Every structure is written in C-alpha cells, then in structure tokens.
C-alpha cells in the first residue's frame, strides 16, 4: 500500500476516460465524482470506481458522448434526458440547470432521465453549496435493502445528500445511504471474514444476521423502526422513478456484469435552493455560524466526539490535501495495466 | 373508555376554539390538524392536544386574530409571517400559497415566520396530496434529541412529512419525528412504569437506557447508525430554523409551561411540487400503483406484514370512520369541564 497525489490521481482518471473515446465534459465531470469520494475519505465511491467505468463504457452501457437535452420544462422545474450519460456527467448538468433556475426562481428542481451511476451523491449536493445553494440529491439502484420486516431485496442504497453553504469554512453536507450501511461493506467484511455489526443485514428470510456469508440483503436505517429508513428510502425513489418516468429499484438491471452493454436507464433527481431568496444572507449565515459554533462544543459521551454532516470528511480531506491519497497494492496494479492499455503515465507514488 | 364520532369531536374542538375568541378560521385550521391526528391513530398529536392549545391561547402565547404576511418572496418562493399564530393555521396557509406557486412554476417553496406548535407534520403534507402535489413539511422544536455520541438534548424532534398523490386510493403518507421515537412515549411508559425500547433514550452521560425515569434526552433514528438521523434532523433544522431566520432548537423555549403568555417564535417550512410539471401524470400514477402494488405485495418476515408509509394509519382511519375515535375516561373529563367553562355541548359517546 502506498500514498498517490489528489492530482497524479485526478490527471491520471481523466487521461483514460478520454483515451477510451469519452467527451471532454464526460472526462472531467467524472473525473470529478471520483476525486471527490477519494478526497473525502468515501473511497467505496473514490479511484477504484475508474475501473468499473472504463468497463461500462467500453461496453456500450454508458455512452462516450452523450447529448442532455431537456425533454420539457416550465417555472423552475424541468425533466433532462441525459443520453444514457454517465451518472457524474449527468447530474453534474442536471445541478448546474437546478441552480440556473434557482438564481431566478429561488428555487430549481431537475428530474434527471436515461442517467447512470454517479458515484457519491454529495459530489453534486456539494456542488451547489460551494455556489451558495442549498443541494439536494437523489437517485435509486438496483435493489438490495428490505423493507421493515421484509423478507426480500426491495429498494437500492437509495442515497440522500444535502448540501449546505457555510460561511468561512467548508459547507454542511449529508452523504448517506438509507440502508444503515452501504453494500460495498458487507463485500468487505466477507473478504475480511469478520462479522458485520448487528442489525445491518439479513438472511434470505428476513432475520438479521451479522454474517456477511449469510447476507441476502440490507437493512433500513433505524433498526427496530427501520421503517422510518425504509419511508426514506421510499422519497427518493418517488423524486428518483415514479417522477422522472425511469424504473424502479427492483425493475433496475444489476449494477455489476456481466451485461455491459444494455443501457440501465437510472433516473435521479436535483434540487436548488437560493438562501437570499427567503432571506437576509447575512442572518443565515449567523445562523449557521451559530448552529455549528454550537453543535461542535456541545457534550459529548466518554471519550467521544460530537460532529455536523461533513466534519468527517473535511478531516481526512484535509489530511488528503497534503499527505496524500492511500492506494493499496491491488488498485494500483489495475492501474499500472490501464496505463498500459491506453498509453497514459500512471500516478507518480510516495 | 368509551368511543366518539369523528364529527363530534371535530364539531366539539372548533366550537370551543371560537368561545375563546378565535378567528374562524383559526379555529378550522387548529382543529383539522388534531382530527387530522385522531383519525390516523396518531393520537399524541390529536384531539388531546385541545387542552394545551386554549391554554396557550388565553396566556396570549397563541394570537386569537392572526395576521398572516408575506415579508417577501421572488419566483416560486416566499417567506410568510404568521404573526404567532396557531402552528395549524400558519402552516395551513402556507400550504395553500406552495401549491398555488406550485401550479405556477411547477414547485412551491415557503419559509413560515412566527408561528408555533402545529401538531401532526403530514396534516399540511397529506393536504398537498390530496390536491395532487407532492408536499414537504420540515419544523423543529425545543431540544429533546442528542447527536450521535452526544451528551445533552440539541435538536428538537424535528419531523418530516412528505404526501405524494396515489391513484385510486389514499396518498402515500410519511410523518415521522427524526428521534428513534417521539417524547411523549417516555411520559406514556413512566406512566406504565414500562421500560422502553433500547436505542431510543440516553441518561444524562449520553448512555442508553430503558428507564424511562433515567432518560434525559431522546436518540437519533439510526441506532449505532444514529449519526443519520442526526444528520437528518440537521437539515429540517437548516430549513426550520437557519432559512426562517427563527430560533434553533437549543434557542427555543419549552413547548410546556409555566410561560404560556410569551410566544415561542417557531419557524417551519413548506414545499409543493407538481407532478405535471415534470411529466404525464398518467404515467405518475401508473408507476406510483405498480410501486405500491409491488411494496405491499412484497414478502414478509415470519408472520410479519410489509406496508408503505401511510398504510397503517388508512387502517385506523378507516376504522374510526365507522367505529370512532376511542375517548380515555381523564380525556373525556377535560372535555366536560371545557364544555361547562365555554358553554358548549360536550362529544355525544358510545
Ligand atoms: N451512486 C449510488 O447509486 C449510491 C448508492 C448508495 C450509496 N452511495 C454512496 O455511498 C457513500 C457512503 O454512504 P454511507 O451511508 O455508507 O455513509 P456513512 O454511513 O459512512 O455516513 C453518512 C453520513 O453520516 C455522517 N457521519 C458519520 N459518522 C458520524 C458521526 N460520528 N457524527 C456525525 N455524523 C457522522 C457522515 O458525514 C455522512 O454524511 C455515499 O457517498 C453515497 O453517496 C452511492
Ligand atoms: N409538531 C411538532 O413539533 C412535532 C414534533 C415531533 C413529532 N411530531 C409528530 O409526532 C407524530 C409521530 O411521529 P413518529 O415518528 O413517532 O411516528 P411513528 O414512528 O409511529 O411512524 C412514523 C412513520 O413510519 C411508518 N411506519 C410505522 N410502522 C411501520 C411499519 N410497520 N411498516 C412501514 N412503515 C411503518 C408510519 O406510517 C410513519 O409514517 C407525527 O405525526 C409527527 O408529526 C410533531
């Protein structure tokens, strides 16, 4: 294992989406889905996404140069057809679109049509905050978690991300999968061969087990009333599917082979709001300044620590800034041989 | 014990709300959200609640006459000032003016100044559903809840309430507090002398405990997954509070006495959006039946049952419109005494 710069790694991502054949705009937007879950220390969504995508679109399922265009929209709303683009590049537009009308409606809602996986939801919700906008995302998957006492996959990891502006300091921001935990874990432990924690998966029969051998399926957030996350997992669905017309969860086509060609159709969906559209920017910026000042110092257990949406992140973000991402032995070997195939320098190590 | 009939009551609450010297349609507003509750069996937030409301009306922390205002607002949005009026009735109203934005820019977003408690979140959520819209609801409260590894009460228990339009049957329906489970089932289990459930109540170091006697503050939804739902009640708190320019949780005064004449200040929140707007509501609602048909249709645990958010509470409603709501015998007592200090006819039972 061995440390890579945020730049070496970013230079290096975009050089291969564009040997493959991939959009300018494809190639950067992501590029920068990656960089941020690399970053921010959610590296389940970070690098070692690049190979998954090279594979997708070499495929055909995900389109090299897709053409968004907006199928239809009135007021501050408006449905995008993003040509079976790549998640990132795809609600990357979507949120641009969603703050353009947000700047003059006060507010923007984006349905997102024919899209992909986008890696971390807080990539785009993120986005709007660092504008000055409060950003919402959503999107759903192929299914994997239950319903509160099911006894079946029923929705995907459905993720939430809201982004929060901040004042002179990095942005509030809630990255979360509605199941307590996300998939790539219980993949994890099962290499590890450990026990998962308790209540964060179940068996084909709907009981809980902490085998990762056993596992069959996720559970909602919120364990005994798991159907508080799973209600959750049913919103983003609504504003991922039923409103923007793609299919749901469980009609989803898997996220993983051995089809890489037949286009999966994902929709998601993107929300703007403009702070000095309800009020004094000034008093919310206050307010927030308060709201964290206050949160930080508030008590905490024995030997823990209390922390906002984010403060996670911009911890190990920062650690990233100047020491440097960790890449494992196996990743950088994919990388050594996708440098190879596509004639690009792989990232320089430390 | 005995049961009432859902007009009875209802007649009963708005008649008393008017002998106090209520505006009419305070009186409509304060007594659809408690009808709102006792008909979807979420009787905390019910006609029980009828005792405290004339409390704080005549102490003056609850305006008779309110004024509701506009301060300002561009586009599809808009900050009202409920000049203290009844939670119901500012938070009514505000609906009202999200769908009326709604129809005209596709979404409709509200921020709520001055008002107050305004009892079930889905009565405002379930009223955009019933008009078609898909409606939000966010408001805080004084602090009950600590963040994850907290050790003090921070945020309130912030609900969420999302409506979304069904088809051929009742809208789908979700209201729930961002705690593992609200206040008022601690009051409810010391009064058994029961322990609760584990996971839902800390000590004063932070620490769960079963004893409703011990508790302190109430847990984030999420268990050792509760930085979720604290991450959750964040951003109802950021649209309650932070884009209201009212008063944080922590910032709050309580909710109960001895001051039932100095008003709270209590901000919220109100979203619409229009499903028409982002596309053909024929296929809305097919995907929206399909959704449901295939949810409740899904497989259960062992003698366990699945349902969507809403589904259990159209269960009771529906049982209560033939039945009627079940009266405790110290509820129905209030009742006579309120009817006796007003001079109007106490809930005819059975
Ligand atoms: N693209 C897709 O289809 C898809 C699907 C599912 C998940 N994802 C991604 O998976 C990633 C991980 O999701 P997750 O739910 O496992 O993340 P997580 O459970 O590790 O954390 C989510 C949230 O809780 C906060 N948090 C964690 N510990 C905390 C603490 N001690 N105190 C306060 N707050 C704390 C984090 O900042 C974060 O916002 C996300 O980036 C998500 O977007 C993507
Ligand atoms: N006015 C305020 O300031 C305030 C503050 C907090 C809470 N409240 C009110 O408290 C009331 C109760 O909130 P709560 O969170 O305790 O309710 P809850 O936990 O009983 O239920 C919340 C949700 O989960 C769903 N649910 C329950 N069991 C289920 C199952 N088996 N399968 C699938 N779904 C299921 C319910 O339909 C509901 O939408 C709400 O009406 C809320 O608005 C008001």
Same mark, same amino acid.
């Given at each position: 294992?061995?440390?890579?710069? @945020?730049?070496?790694?970013?230079?290096?991502?975009?050089? +291969?989406? @564009?040997?493959?054949?991939? &959009?300018?705009?494809?190639? &950067?937007?992501?590029?920068?889905?990656?960089?941020?879950?690399?970053?921010?220390?959610?590296?389940?969504?970070?690098?070692?996404?690049?190979?998954?995508?090279?594979?997708?679109?070499?495929?055909?399922?995900?389109?090299?140069?897709?053409?968004?265009?907006?199928?239809?929209?009135?007021?501050?709303?408006?449905?995008?057809?993003?040509?079976?683009?790549?998640?990132?590049?795809?609600?990357?537009?979507?949120?641009?679109?969603?703050? %353009?009308?947000?700047?003059?409606?006060?507010?923007?809602?984006?349905?997102?049509?024919?899209?992909?996986?986008?890696?971390? %939801?807080?990539?785009?919700?993120?986005?709007?905050?660092?504008? /000055?906008?409060?950003?919402?995302?959503?999107?759903?998957?192929?299914?994997?978690?239950?319903?509160?006492?099911?006894?079946?996959?029923?929705?995907?990891?459905?993720?939430? *991300?809201?982004?929060?502006?901040?004042?002179?300091?990095?942005?509030?921001? @809630?990255?979360?999968?509605?199941?307590?935990?996300?998939?790539?874990?219980?993949?994890?432990?099962?290499?590890? /061969?450990?026990?998962?924690?308790?209540?964060?998966? $179940? &068996?084909?029969?709907?009981?809980?087990?902490?085998?990762?051998?056993?596992?069959?399926?996720?559970?909602?957030?919120? /364990?005994?009333? !798991?159907?508080?996350?799973?209600?959750?997992? !049913? +919103?983003?669905?609504?504003?991922?599917?039923?409103?923007?017309?793609?299919?749901? $969860?469980?009609?989803?086509?898997?996220?993983? !082979?051995? &089809?890489?060609?037949?286009?999966?159709?994902?929709?998601?969906?993107?929300?703007?709001?403009?702070?000095? *559209?309800?009020?004094?920017?000034?008093?919310?910026?206050?307010?927030?300044?308060?709201?964290?000042?206050?949160?930080?110092?508030?008590?905490?257990?024995?030997?823990?620590?209390?922390? *906002?949406?984010?403060?996670?992140?911009?911890?190990? %973000?920062?650690?990233?800034?100047?020491?440097?991402?960790?890449?494992?032995?196996?990743?950088?070997?994919?990388?050594?041989? @996708?440098?190879?195939?596509?004639?690009?320098?792989?990232?320089?190590?430390?």
């Amino acid at each position: 294992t061995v440390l890579a710069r @945020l730049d070496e790694l970013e230079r290096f991502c975009r050089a +291969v989406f @564009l040997a493959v054949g991939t &959009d300018e705009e494809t190639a &950067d937007a992501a590029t920068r889905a990656m960089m941020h879950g690399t970053r921010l220390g959610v590296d389940s969504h970070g690098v070692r996404l690049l190979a998954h995508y090279v594979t997708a679109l070499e495929g055909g399922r995900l389109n090299r140069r897709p053409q968004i265009s907006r199928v239809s929209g009135f007021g501050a709303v408006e449905t995008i057809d993003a040509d079976h683009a790549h998640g990132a590049r795809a609600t990357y537009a979507a949120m641009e679109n969603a703050m %353009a009308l947000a700047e003059k409606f006060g507010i923007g809602a984006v349905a997102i049509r024919n899209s992909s996986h986008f890696g971390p %939801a807080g990539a785009y919700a993120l986005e709007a905050a660092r504008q /000055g906008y409060i950003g919402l995302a959503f999107c759903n998957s192929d299914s994997f978690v239950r319903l509160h006492d099911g006894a079946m996959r029923f929705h995907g990891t459905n993720p939430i *991300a809201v982004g929060v502006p901040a004042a002179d300091d990095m942005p509030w921001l @809630l990255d979360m999968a509605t199941s307590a935990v996300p998939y790539n874990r219980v993949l994890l432990y099962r290499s590890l /061969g450990q026990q998962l924690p308790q209540g964060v998966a $179940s &068996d084909g029969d709907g009981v809980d087990t902490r085998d990762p051998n056993a596992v069959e399926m996720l559970a909602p957030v919120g /364990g005994e009333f !798991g159907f508080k996350g799973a209600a959750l997992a !049913g +919103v983003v669905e609504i504003f991922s599917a039923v409103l923007t017309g793609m299919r749901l $969860s469980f009609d989803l086509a898997p996220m993983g !082979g051995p &089809d890489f060609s037949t286009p999966r159709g994902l929709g998601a969906f993107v929300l703007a709001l403009k702070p000095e *559209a309800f009020l004094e920017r000034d008093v919310f910026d206050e307010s927030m300044k308060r709201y964290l000042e206050v949160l930080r110092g508030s008590p905490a257990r024995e030997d823990c620590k209390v922390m *906002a949406p984010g403060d996670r992140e911009w911890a190990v %973000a920062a650690k990233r800034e100047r020491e440097g991402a960790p890449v494992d032995p196996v990743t950088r070997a994919a990388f050594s041989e @996708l440098a190879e195939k596509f004639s690009v320098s792989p990232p320089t190590y430390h």
